Amino acid sequence: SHKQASCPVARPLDVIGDGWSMLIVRDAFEGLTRFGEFQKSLGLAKNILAARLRNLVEHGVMVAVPAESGSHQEYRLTDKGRALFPLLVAIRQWGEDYFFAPDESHVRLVERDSGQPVPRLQVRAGDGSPLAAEDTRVSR
Amino acid sequence: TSHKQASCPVARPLDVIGDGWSMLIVRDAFEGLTRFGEFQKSLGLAKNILAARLRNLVEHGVMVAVPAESGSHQEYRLTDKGRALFPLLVAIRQWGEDYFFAPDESHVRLVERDSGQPVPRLQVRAGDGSPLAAEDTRVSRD
């Protein structure tokens, strides 16, 4: 669809530009691996979960294989899929920052050893200082 | 808008950006496009449909559509909420750069205006500033 856009922002939208793919990815980062685990987490219709998972596998974000004991089938993040972590954190932080009323609460992403919330993910310059959007440009 | 009442902070934003085009309209906004005709020539998206996605970014508070201060046309401008997408945008661009191009393929680069020089890869970091792997985090009901 955008697969032959020259744009690095557009190509990935073919894979993650939908209402569910990043939530399957969120769940995989939380340790879910089985089709039925995803279905019950997402509440998503089986055939529709099937299509989103199929697409993630076709795009090399996940690999579906048999479990070690051969007792069932699992889906795991590839290196390409694990690389979605910064994007996932950015989506989470933007949701935290803009999508909840003052009286609502939500889960937090925390350091395993700390329990301390993971800090805001910032764009930084080569010197390590905070870099604002207006101090960048896109070059051909 | 089917994640509107989800408890999850990842899910609620997908109502807004979980599609093939929203983040490209936002891409263009960061590049200084503000007029309907500019987005249309940039995106090659059918006009009526571009119009719908724009009106929907406005409804979700990512942009506003205001009369141009001199003249007879409307301008689309990022709000604070919309400008706050820049990290997310960089993250998408870099994942696209890392995994979506043949080694033979060229593409545009995000660079520092002063020096630039490609903007450094994003990095999830711990409180102490050190790189933090997904496996070193967890999701907590605090």
Ligand SMILES: OC[C@H]1O[C@H](O)[C@H](O)[C@@H](O)[C@@H]1O
């Ligand atoms: O990342 C967790 C926290 O970070 C920021 O302060 C958000 O705006 C806040 O609401 C959220 O709970």
